[PDB]
Design a protein around this nucleic acid. Sequence first.
RNA 1: AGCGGCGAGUACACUGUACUUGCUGCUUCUUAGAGGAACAUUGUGUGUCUAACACAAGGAAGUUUAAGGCAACAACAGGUCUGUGAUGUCCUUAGAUGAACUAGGCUGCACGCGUGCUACACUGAUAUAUAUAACGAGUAAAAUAUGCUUGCAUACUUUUCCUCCGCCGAAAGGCGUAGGUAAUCUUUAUCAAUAUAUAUCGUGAUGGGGAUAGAUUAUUGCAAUUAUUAAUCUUGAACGAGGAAUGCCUAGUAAGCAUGAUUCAUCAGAUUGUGCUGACUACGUCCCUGCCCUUUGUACACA
Lengths: 180, 138, 48, 128, 154, 96, 41, 98
Amino acid sequence: DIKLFKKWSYEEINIADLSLVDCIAVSQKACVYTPHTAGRYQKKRFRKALCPIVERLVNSMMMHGRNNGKKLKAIRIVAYAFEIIHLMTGENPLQVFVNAVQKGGPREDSTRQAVDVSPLRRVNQAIYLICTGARNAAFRNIKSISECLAEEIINCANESSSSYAIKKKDEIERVAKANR
Amino acid sequence: KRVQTFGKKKTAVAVATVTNGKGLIKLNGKNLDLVEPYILKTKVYEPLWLIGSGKLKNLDIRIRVKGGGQTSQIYAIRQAIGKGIISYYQKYVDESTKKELKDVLLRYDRSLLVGDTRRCEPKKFGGKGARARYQKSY
Amino acid sequence: VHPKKYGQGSRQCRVCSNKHAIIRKYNINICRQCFRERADIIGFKKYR
Amino acid sequence: QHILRILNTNVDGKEKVIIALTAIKGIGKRMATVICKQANVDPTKRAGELTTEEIDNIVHIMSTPTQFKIPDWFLNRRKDLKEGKNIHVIANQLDSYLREDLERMKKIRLHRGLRHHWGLRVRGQHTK
Amino acid sequence: RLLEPVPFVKTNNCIKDVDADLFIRSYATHLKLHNKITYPKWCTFVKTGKGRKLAPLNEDWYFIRASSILRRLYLHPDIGVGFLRRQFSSKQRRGVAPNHTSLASGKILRSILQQLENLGYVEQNPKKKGRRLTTKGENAINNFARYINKKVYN
Amino acid sequence: DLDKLLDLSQDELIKLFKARQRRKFQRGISKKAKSLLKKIRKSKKNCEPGEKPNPVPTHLRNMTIIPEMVGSIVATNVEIKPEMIGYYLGEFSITY
Amino acid sequence: KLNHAVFIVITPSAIAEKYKVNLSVARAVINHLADSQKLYT
Amino acid sequence: IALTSKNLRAIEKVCSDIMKGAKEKNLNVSGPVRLPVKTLRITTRKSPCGEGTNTWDRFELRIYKRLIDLYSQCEVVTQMTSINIDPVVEVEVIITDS
RNA sequence: AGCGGCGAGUACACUGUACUUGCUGCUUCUUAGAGGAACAUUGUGUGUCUAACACAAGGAAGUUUAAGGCAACAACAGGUCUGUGAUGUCCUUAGAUGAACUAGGCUGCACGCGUGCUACACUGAUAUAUAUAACGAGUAAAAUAUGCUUGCAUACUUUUCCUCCGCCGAAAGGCGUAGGUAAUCUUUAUCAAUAUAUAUCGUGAUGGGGAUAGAUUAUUGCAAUUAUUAAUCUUGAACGAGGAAUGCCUAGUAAGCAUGAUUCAUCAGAUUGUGCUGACUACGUCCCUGCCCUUUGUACACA
């Protein structure tokens, strides 16, 4: 039916923990050719999780200094990035995407005494950590942010040490070994 | 014969007229293809998959679209054509399939038949923002 | 003198007789000070 | 092929062929560009396949280009009020002629010269 | 790629039905071949827009500007130099002071319109004070549109 | 360099000058300016060439220098010059 | 810093990874074989 | 025949006054005109002195226009208006033919 | 403001179409006169079955549909007598403490703090254009002729707002006119920017980015020096996301981006409105700060 960037329809997904599934919320109602729909989140507790994870990045990687407030170019960079994922790797860009978002969330953090993370913040910190990997992998890194993305999502989805998010996840888990 | 229908959603108000013919659809002098966003072109295409091009192949729906945001034009035009096809089914062509026509539109969503009333507000006093104050010093 | 039909001198408030804080919106030719208390009688209905 | 060193920096060999002549001076990309178009050098190629022949064409181009078709205003320091009409004099000679200009204001020694001498912006940098 | 399936009944009776930027690109293509017009030798030393602050760097800025201005003529049979200036408005950065939107340069569009008048594709008239296409212009641009339509359809 | 400027008419002297003086002169000269000129010429003819001309009373900052009245000191000791005329007077108290 | 050169799966990114080239000359080699960014065939 | 005022009830009553005479006299009368209202608004600071928080007030004037036409005698319509118009309302007259 | 309809078509389809002229079959459409509709609304739940609160639903409208203003009692020895011919008391006027005129100052600067304005790029630097809305706002002087000898006096239109157009000038700007005291002319079948898709570059203190210059050209005002404003060329400081500290902020809002209006002859980098893109997460807490209530202890009452 629909086609993400006229290419993808994500008709097969991974099981993951089956809990992040409701948070990632990939379904027909959230199906769209490109992100940056008119979706609204300011009424309840679900529809922020209802919003597709693709939008959850096109709106979250956006912040860096002057580069703030440019979102059409965020859709641009994600559209190109999805190209490079399935090109440098033989798997579905959105499938390795789901893999990365699933295995890029901190399983616990003390934050005042360790405490488990709800799936909402599991997805949240995964997105945040990969996007702040993107910013410092686009600053002073020779390579452009697009190929930086193509490197970081595979690094986080295959458990490769090069991803910033996984190092930060290990640091965040390490606090448990000292408190709990 | 001839029915004139309107669509009000966000800034843009679309006007269309369903007329007798073979399926001639016109968007100003443009067609449904050169507005630019192929993403919203298929958003407007969704009803044509819901109903079918075969039925559109026997009536003409002229459109004038003017002013407003890019999203609002498409969102107004889908409602305008839906109201037009509903009026034609009620008046001239056929009622029983109109019953199911409403049902198949509503099954996809309620957003097509009626849009949203979300709109911006009068910015408030205190600073540049509506709800943001000038930085304070002590 | 050095008069001309230009600048802040050629016009002033018509009650305080001062050139400071004069508003000419719709050529009202009044100062904000006295205007803020004439606003209701003139018709300026503080609404929203 | 690449890396040619001349009176102005031309290390930008891996860079573009036109930028090979626009980075030498006049970062404003206007004097450099008018010199480029008067020298008739395409931009599709890169600076690694440039010719000393084209460079010599340029060293004839920038020689008092008032003789060329360029207008009066576009050229830097158009009037510089004196018995004639002076010119943009690029790189070391640029520094020399604007040195002549900065010494000639010592006789002026008016408010603006005294201020720029004592270390104040000619318009006020407003350290207030 | 730029094509998508068309199940609705079309007309293809004019140029507004066909693409705009690629149509003016193909018009520039035919314009190189037939070369009824000049470059001219006057546009090369003045930037397109006041706030552009860059040279155009295309060797075709004038060539596509004429094409676009013709497309604007086709769309609006009543336009003026102010209209084209506004249509070509661009940002301008004033250094330490904020950006501001400012119009284009009048003389470039004035020369383009005078060249169009010499070409006779457009004309003036008191009634319909803006620029109005001649009927010969209509037929030429319409057969041009049909040629453009067919060369991409089949 | 200087004699042609001394004898040259205002209409082309102002073309030698810059448009900031051009607009001023083509738009107005005002009566005080002509009084000051007809008086400084009197002072220039009366005074000896062995010493500089005396300053001008009733000080003002908008007496354009036109190179046919070079020599004066002012009532601020920067002598007006052929490179200096198109700059207005200034010469004020910015005491530091 | 830059050290890649035009000297020596037509995907721009993959070929750039394979041959350590600039992106302009990577699209140049793409043209050299086939004959902003595009959707792939 | 157009009317000017600021408070809508004045125009409403003096407009209800309009068509009754036309119905009585069976004239060739054109239809009414219902223009969007104009809003005149200004902003001004409170606090005569500069001390304290800076606070301002916003004002508003609603301005109401309608236009009518009648193929009726100018003097008779002028009088049948002047009989029942308020000085707080302004009127202009013009005629039609068919 | 239109919708038609036909009146002739300019090019195509074939048994209506974009561009045009003109009026009238007609007013949901462009709109406002008017009221209505939202009422824990219906059922499935929590609650002493009371006050209240939940889900689902119709519905544009379910957090009072959101957002705008009005602010009781009492107080501050808060600000203002520099707003007033609102005002007491004291104080002063020809060598004014009244008015005008010349010039100057609040733009001057080791520094510090605000409000802000402009980068640290490739999520970007750059050239082309389509799809772009709203609040907006807008009318006692020119010049000519004569007389005296460019200036003075006297006579005739109205320039003295925004401007559209057609010209000239790279531009700034200059010229002569259409419209309009205004849903009618700027302008509105359309005014900015973040755009757009492909094109130059492809993070190399880089071409990023602009603190910084002299040279000037036109406008503004009689006067621009203290480079008011402004077009070009030359400029190349800091800047690798940030000391101790600290501000504001939950929905078409923050932020980014512009832009209207005021003060206006000229000048936002100020203030007040409007719109576009519609971000990360909270159906919360009393930890800090600061309030409200109850009890309690006071040797405090200027608390």
